[PDB]
Amino acid sequence: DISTLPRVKVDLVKPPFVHAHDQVAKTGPRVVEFTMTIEEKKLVIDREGTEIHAMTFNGSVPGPLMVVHENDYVELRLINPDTNTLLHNIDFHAATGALGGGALTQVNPGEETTLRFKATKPGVFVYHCAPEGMVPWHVTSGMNGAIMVLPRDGLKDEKGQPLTYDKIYYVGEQDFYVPKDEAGNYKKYETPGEAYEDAVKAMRTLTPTHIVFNGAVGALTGDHALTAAVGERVLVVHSQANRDTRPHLIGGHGDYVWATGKFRNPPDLDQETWLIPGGTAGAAFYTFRQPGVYAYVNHNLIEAFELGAAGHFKVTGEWNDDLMTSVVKPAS
Amino acid sequence: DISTLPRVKVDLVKPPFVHAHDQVAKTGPRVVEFTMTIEEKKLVIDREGTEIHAMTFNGSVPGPLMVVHENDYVELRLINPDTNTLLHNIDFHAATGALGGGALTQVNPGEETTLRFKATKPGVFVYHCAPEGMVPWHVTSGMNGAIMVLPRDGLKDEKGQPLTYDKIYYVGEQDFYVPKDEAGNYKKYETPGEAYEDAVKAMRTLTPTHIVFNGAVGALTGDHALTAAVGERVLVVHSQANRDTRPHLIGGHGDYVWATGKFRNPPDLDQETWLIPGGTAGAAFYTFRQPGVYAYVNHNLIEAFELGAAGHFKVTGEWNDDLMTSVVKPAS
Amino acid sequence: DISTLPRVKVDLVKPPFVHAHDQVAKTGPRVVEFTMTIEEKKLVIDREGTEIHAMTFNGSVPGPLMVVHENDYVELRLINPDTNTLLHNIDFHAATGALGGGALTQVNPGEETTLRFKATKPGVFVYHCAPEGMVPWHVTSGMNGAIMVLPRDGLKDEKGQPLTYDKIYYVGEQDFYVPKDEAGNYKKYETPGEAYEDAVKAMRTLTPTHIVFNGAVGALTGDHALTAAVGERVLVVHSQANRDTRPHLIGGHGDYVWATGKFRNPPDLDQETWLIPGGTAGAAFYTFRQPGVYAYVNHNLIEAFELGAAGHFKVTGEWNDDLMTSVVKPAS
Ligand SMILES: O=N[O-]
Ligand SMILES: O=N[O-]
Ligand SMILES: O=N[O-]
Ligand SMILES: O=N[O-]
Ligand SMILES: O=N[O-]
Ligand SMILES: O=N[O-]
Ligand SMILES: O=N[O-]
Ligand SMILES: O=N[O-]
Ligand SMILES: O=N[O-]
Ligand SMILES: O=N[O-]
Ligand SMILES: O=N[O-]
Ligand SMILES: O=N[O-]
Ligand SMILES: O=N[O-]
Numbered sequence: 001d002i003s004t005l006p007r008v009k010v011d012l013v014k015p016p017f018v019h020a021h022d023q024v025a026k027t028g029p030r031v032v033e034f035t036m037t038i039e040e041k042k043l044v045i046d047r048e049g050t051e052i053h054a055m056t057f058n059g060s061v062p063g064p065l066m067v068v069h070e071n072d073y074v075e076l077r078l079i080n081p082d083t084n085t086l087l088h089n090i091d092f093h094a095a096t097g098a099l100g101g102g103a104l105t106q107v108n109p110g111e112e113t114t115l116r117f118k119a120t121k122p123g124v125f126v127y128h129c130a131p132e133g134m135v136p137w138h139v140t141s142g143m144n145g146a147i148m149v150l151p152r153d154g155l156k157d158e159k160g161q162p163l164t165y166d167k168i169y170y171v172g173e174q175d176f177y178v179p180k181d182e183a184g185n186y187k188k189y190e191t192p193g194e195a196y197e198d199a200v201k202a203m204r205t206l207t208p209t210h211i212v213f214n215g216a217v218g219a220l221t222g223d224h225a226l227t228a229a230v231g232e233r234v235l236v237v238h239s240q241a242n243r244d245t246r247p248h249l250i251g252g253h254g255d256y257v258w259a260t261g262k263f264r265n266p267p268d269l270d271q272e273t274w275l276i277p278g279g280t281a282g283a284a285f286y287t288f289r290q291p292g293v294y295a296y297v298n299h300n301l302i303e304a305f306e307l308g309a310a311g312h313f314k315v316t317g318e319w320n321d322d323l324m325t326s327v328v329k330p331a332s
Numbered sequence: 333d334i335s336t337l338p339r340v341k342v343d344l345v346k347p348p349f350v351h352a353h354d355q356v357a358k359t360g361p362r363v364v365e366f367t368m369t370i371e372e373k374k375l376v377i378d379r380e381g382t383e384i385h386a387m388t389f390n391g392s393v394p395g396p397l398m399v400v401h402e403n404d405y406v407e408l409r410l411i412n413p414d415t416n417t418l419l420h421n422i423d424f425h426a427a428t429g430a431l432g433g434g435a436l437t438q439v440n441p442g443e444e445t446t447l448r449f450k451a452t453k454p455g456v457f458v459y460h461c462a463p464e465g466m467v468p469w470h471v472t473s474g475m476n477g478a479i480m481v482l483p484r485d486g487l488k489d490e491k492g493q494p495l496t497y498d499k500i501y502y503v504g505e506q507d508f509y510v511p512k513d514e515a516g517n518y519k520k521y522e523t524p525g526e527a528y529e530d531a532v533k534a535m536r537t538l539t540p541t542h543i544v545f546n547g548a549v550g551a552l553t554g555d556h557a558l559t560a561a562v563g564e565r566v567l568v569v570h571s572q573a574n575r576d577t578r579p580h581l582i583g584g585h586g587d588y589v590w591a592t593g594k595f596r597n598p599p600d601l602d603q604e605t606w607l608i609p610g611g612t613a614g615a616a617f618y619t620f621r622q623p624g625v626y627a628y629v630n631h632n633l634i635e636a637f638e639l640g641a642a643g644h645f646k647v648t649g650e651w652n653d654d655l656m657t658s659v660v661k662p663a664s
Numbered sequence: 665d666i667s668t669l670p671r672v673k674v675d676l677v678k679p680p681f682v683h684a685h686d687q688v689a690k691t692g693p694r695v696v697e698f699t700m701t702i703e704e705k706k707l708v709i710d711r712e713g714t715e716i717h718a719m720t721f722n723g724s725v726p727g728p729l730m731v732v733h734e735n736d737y738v739e740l741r742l743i744n745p746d747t748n749t750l751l752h753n754i755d756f757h758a759a760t761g762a763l764g765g766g767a768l769t770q771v772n773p774g775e776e777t778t779l780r781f782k783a784t785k786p787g788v789f790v791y792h793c794a795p796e797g798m799v800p801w802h803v804t805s806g807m808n809g810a811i812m813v814l815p816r817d818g819l820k821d822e823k824g825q826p827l828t829y830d831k832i833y834y835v836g837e838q839d840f841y842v843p844k845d846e847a848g849n850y851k852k853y854e855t856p857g858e859a860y861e862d863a864v865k866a867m868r869t870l871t872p873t874h875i876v877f878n879g880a881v882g883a884l885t886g887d888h889a890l891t892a893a894v895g896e897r898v899l900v901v902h903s904q905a906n907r908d909t910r911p912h913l914i915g916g917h918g919d920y921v922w923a924t925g926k927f928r929n930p931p932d933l934d935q936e937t938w939l940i941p942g943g944t945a946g947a948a949f950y951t952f953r954q955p956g957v958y959a960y961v962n963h964n965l966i967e968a969f970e971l972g973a974a975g976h977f978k979v980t981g982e983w984n985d986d987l988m989t990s991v992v993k994p995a996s
């Protein structure tokens with residue numbers, strides 16, 4: 001009887017940060033209430049000033065990470081304000097039935113809807129917009145995010161012992177297909193609708209013009225680098241709603257990795273690089289052992305360093321010479 | 333002594349259906365006899381009427397699913413009628429030696445051959461044509477299919493308990509590379525041979541023009557949608573002889589998945605999306621829990637909704653509001 | 665105390681061969697000393713005579729396989745002679761800290777450096793050049809190789825029983841992006857530096873012009889085919905520093921496969937084809953059961969047979985008719 005379950009309202013936070021949650025469930029099953037507002041907005045995606053009309057959940061690319069526990073109910077109020085121009089909806093890969101909720105959530109501008117589903121399978125999962133006839137255009141304009149359904153007793157290693165993370169970050173990786181003129185210059189449009197047929201042609205090349213973390217080239221660098229300390233246990237959730245990626249922590253490893261993101265399976269150990277298929281979210285757990293700058297990349301290095309799929313961690317603490325040392329510094 | 337084994341002749345059926353078989357073996361090892369006839373034929377692959385010269389086993393793309401048990405012998409009579417124009421052969425990834433049988437099965441038009449091999453490893457496996465010097469042209473013209481070698485005691489879950497399917501379907505996914513003129517219009521040819529050099533150039537782009545299930549855009553829709561009922565256990569076998577794919581059941585999951593298709597390994601549980609590498613067959617088991625239309629796609633959504641890699645299931649039965657419900661229908 | 669450990673100097677050998685080593689460690693932890701010299705050199709990569717300026721470790725593409733045991737220390741002297749023109753460095757995916765050693769090994773022409781790291785995780789791992797600002801250009805010019813860190817008690821199967829190989833080969837697969845003129849002819853340059861901006865444009869297409877094993881089309885064929893005998897247990901180590909690949913032994917299987925290459929995980933059994941993500945090394949173990957020629961390919965067959973990613977094994981011994989036989993030879 002759902003009316004007798006506790007309700008809890010969660011306020012979401014901007015990626016790469018994740019809303020507060022407990023890893024081990026401190027209550028019984030709950031109805032967990034989330035609100036998201038769709039925002040169509042112009043986004044500058046690179047250092048050259050290339051602009052796209054992005055379609056976002058809650059104003060960010062990716063949309064925010066939602067966190068619940070296995071056998072909670074998720075109740076999402078989805079709002080499409082009348083300042084938007086397009087029909088949108090939401091498909092959760094976590095959900096069962098009605099095209100992951102897509103059949104039930106079609107909202108024109110000026111409409112809202114509330115969907116509830118039971119989170120029956122533990123794992124990280126993609127969610128994304130999927131309106132009939134314009135699915136890849138919405139998704140590759142940024143309209144995707146992820147949801148994490150934790151086991152009620154938290155994460156476990158390959159031996160079934162508890163794994164507890166100290167910090168969690170969410171990296172959404174986005175392939176964009178910005179249309180080009182004859183000479184190869186990016187085109188601009190006043191409205192999302194203007195771009196449509198040109199967007200279709202650009203997508204059909206299967207060759208993204210940009211592949212970015214958190215919505216822009218260089219988004220997770222400088223003042224916005226991810227931080228940790230030596231000895232901290234970090235979980236990085238990574239999603240790609242449309243195209244394969246292969247994450248790699250330069251200078252580290254994935255100590256425990258669920259590459260296809262589903263926590264009933266044992267993790268893969270000691271990964272250098274792992275493949276997350278398009279349409280999937282994965283999760284990697286690592287304990288930092290050395291201080292300094294790390295780069296976190298898609299290890300197609302052209303995709304990383306030319307197209308934008310690279311971010312930084314800055315890690316504080318003590319250097320361990322036993323793990324690595326320069327014996328003779330570069331010299332003639 | 334092979335002459336003392338029972339022989340059984342199987343008549344194959346058109347994909348996505350699969351010939352009758354037992355999951356748990358009701359006899360000892362058998363010699364299982366199959367006949368396939370090669371047909372070169374014109375195929376219309378899209379809604380625009382684009383035509384290719386397809387090269388098929390038994391008249392379909394993909395070729396039919398063959399089903400045997402571990403340590404059966406497969407005996408295939410392969411017929412290349414003199415109405416065809418090309419040399420063909422057959423490579424089974426299930427087989428050991430002679431390039432999977434390719435070295436032994438080269439048939440000019442007007443020839444036939446009979447190959448026997450022992451099915452020593454359980455799993456689903458690709459088979460495909462592979463004539464010396466023209467391998468990718470034959471395969472990407474449709475000349476591929478799959479064979480399932482069941483364990484003698486059927487499928488098992490990750491705990492070694494039996495998994496029994498009620499229904500099985502075979503989805504062959506095909507990347508086509510239709511040559512284009514200067515402006516981007518598809519070219520037409522009177523014979524397969526005419527297309528050769530243009531086919532090579534189109535393949536070298538590594539960019540398919542169409543990616544389809546069961547040989548055409550929209551093949552597994554409408555009257556030809558896959559069917560099931562709530563509560564049915566369905567196994568979907570999916571192959572891709574040349575290029576990676578990432579299947580996803582929109583509104584469902586892969587409850588048990590062998591992404592690289594080999595049944596001695598435990599299945600991955602609760603998958604949203606899985607990667608089947610090119611040159612592999614995989615298998616996903618799901619129990620339907622909700623009625624309605626499901627889309628089964630390659631989750632590069634451009635490949636699905638623009639290039640053709642999408643099909644439908646239509647599922648009958650009772651709606652379960654506990655799993656999903658619309659709390660407030662879309663309204664202003 | 666590192667000064668009290670034995671030191672052993674290893675002389676490396678050219679791929680696809682691997683330096684002598686023990687599978688089960690016959691000593692305690694050691695400091696294992698390697699020397700590599702960077703060579704920038706012109707390489708002819710195809711039958712047409714296309715030339716590139718390759719950037720190599722030790723004169724080969726790929727660089728040589730280094731083999732150590734878990735918890736050995738690796739000490740590498742890296743030499744950049746003054747006949748080279750570029751700055752180089754080395755990132756080991758096996759290592760922890762300082763961008764896998766990349767931050768500590770930047771050598772201008774005429775400089776050398778010595779790095780030491782502890783090999784704390786068992787598996788095969790990529791190493792590659794990674795100079796700030798020019799990472800994918802160095803890697804896709806050939807500057808990558810692999811290192812194998814064996815468990816101290818050797819390899820194990822999925823049940824934890826020993827697996828011993830008789831022979832080991834290293835296949836480095838390389839994606840090249842040779843710049844083209846307007847008509848599609850490959851360009852030539854006097855120096856590596858000349859090619860830079862054209863190289864960047866060619867990489868951004870994400871479409872390699874060549875994909876080769878051991879540095880050239882046809883490198884592992886003819887007199888240079890890999891050899892084995894019926895009954896031999898062969899380990900093939902395969903790396904791809906930048907782009908996904910899907911190896912397949914035509915006429916065989918991967919009996920035990922670590923597709924992402926990390927030996928603390930159980931192997932996948934009976935694989936037809938496996939996916940090694942870009943930025944990873946994998947390893948496949950197979951026992952040959954039939955004599956003859958086998959082709960070892962990336963099973964995107966266009967990548968294999970049109971772009972160059974195919975090699976041969978030649979296997980001697982007795983034919984087994986029980987596994988495969990021609991019942992009726994091709995005839996009218
Ligand atoms: O836009 N409806 O609140
Ligand atoms: O789906 N493309 O990686
Ligand atoms: O092809 N996926 O990066
Ligand atoms: O080691 N990162 O390319
Ligand atoms: O799918 N879980 O790794
Ligand atoms: O075409 N031979 O039956
Ligand atoms: O093999 N291409 O996915
Ligand atoms: O790249 N394979 O869809
Ligand atoms: O949820 N299907 O894209
Ligand atoms: O390879 N079997 O999942
Ligand atoms: O190039 N220094 O030995
Ligand atoms: O990273 N491309 O397969
Ligand atoms: O896309 N990798 O072959």
Ligand SMILES: O=N[O-]
Binds near residue numbers: 431432
């Ligand atoms: O069976 N090799 O394509």
Ligand SMILES: O=N[O-]
Binds near residue numbers: 921923924926929
């Ligand atoms: O990652 N080891 O298969």
Ligand SMILES: [Cu+2]
Binds near residue numbers: 055089129130131138
């Ligand atoms: Cu939308």
Ligand SMILES: [Cu+2]
Binds near residue numbers: 091093128279582
């Ligand atoms: Cu989806």
Ligand SMILES: [Cu+2]
Binds near residue numbers: 419420461462463
């Ligand atoms: Cu053929």
Ligand SMILES: [Cu+2]
Binds near residue numbers: 460611914963
């Ligand atoms: Cu094959």
Ligand SMILES: [Cu+2]
Binds near residue numbers: 719
């Ligand atoms: Cu270099």
Ligand SMILES: [Cu+2]
Binds near residue numbers: 299757792
């Ligand atoms: Cu790397």
